Design a protein around this ligand. Structure first.
Ligand SMILES: Cn1cnc2c1c(=O)[nH]c(=O)n2C
Ligand SMILES: Cn1cnc2c1c(=O)[nH]c(=O)n2C
Ligand SMILES: Cn1cnc2c1c(=O)[nH]c(=O)n2C
Lengths: 107, 109
């Protein structure tokens, strides 16, 4: 659909190449990153690589379901990490852009 | 006068969230003394709540939709950052934020 195309072509593109986006481009690998408690706390892992691939395979039926995936990703970061971690600031900056771009989604 | 987006945020988004059965912990600013959380303002530097947003929507404080959207987001993000992952209020915020998101997916302009 139209909104899904916008979420792919405008929203995701602007988030993907942002200088803070690299921690969010691929699933958290808790082994490599030394986070053995990650999957005990985050029961619904999400990342922009998963969302992008889903957008490119007609996984989503509605824009709502893609935006919910974006929100889960960010919320996972706020929930798991300490308030003072830089990745909290990185997620907030990206989430602001997502909300701005979403406010301009076609209807 | 009021833009279509702020009409929508007020008439659709704030209407749904204010009357919601999980809304009540978010209707007024966190009172750290009444709630007994003496670190709250040490961790949370920009407090947000639905009462403030509701008032800002009534008194045309916002210049753009994304500005009201940001306040909603800050309110929810404060909750996820400050509280423990297992606190019930986190899942109350998640339920309200999912509605917020669903509604803004049909915002005009
Ligand atoms: C999404 N992501 C990617 N890398 C990380 C995270 C995270 O949430 N916490 C965290 O500590 N690290 C290293
Ligand atoms: C403190 N407390 C505990 N439960 C509640 C409240 C309240 O203030 N409003 C309210 O609606 N509910 C259910
Ligand atoms: C927004 N709000 C309202 N009441 C609370 C909170 C909170 O963030 N944590 C928290 O623990 N409590 C009790």
């Amino acid at each position: 659909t139209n909104q899904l195309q916008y979420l792919h072509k405008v929203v995701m593109k602007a988030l993907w190449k942002h200088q803070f986006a690299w921690p969010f481009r691929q699933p958290v690998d808790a082994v490599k990153l030394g986070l053995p408690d990650y999957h005990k706390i985050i029961k619904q892992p999400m990342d922009m690589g998963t969302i992008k691939r889903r957008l490119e395979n007609n996984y989503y039926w509605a824009a709502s379901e893609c935006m919910q995936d974006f929100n889960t990703m960010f919320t996972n970061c706020y929930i798991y990490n300490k308030p003072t971690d830089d990745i909290v600031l990185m997620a907030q900056t990206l989430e602001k852009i997502f909300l701005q771009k979403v406010a301009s989604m076609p209807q």
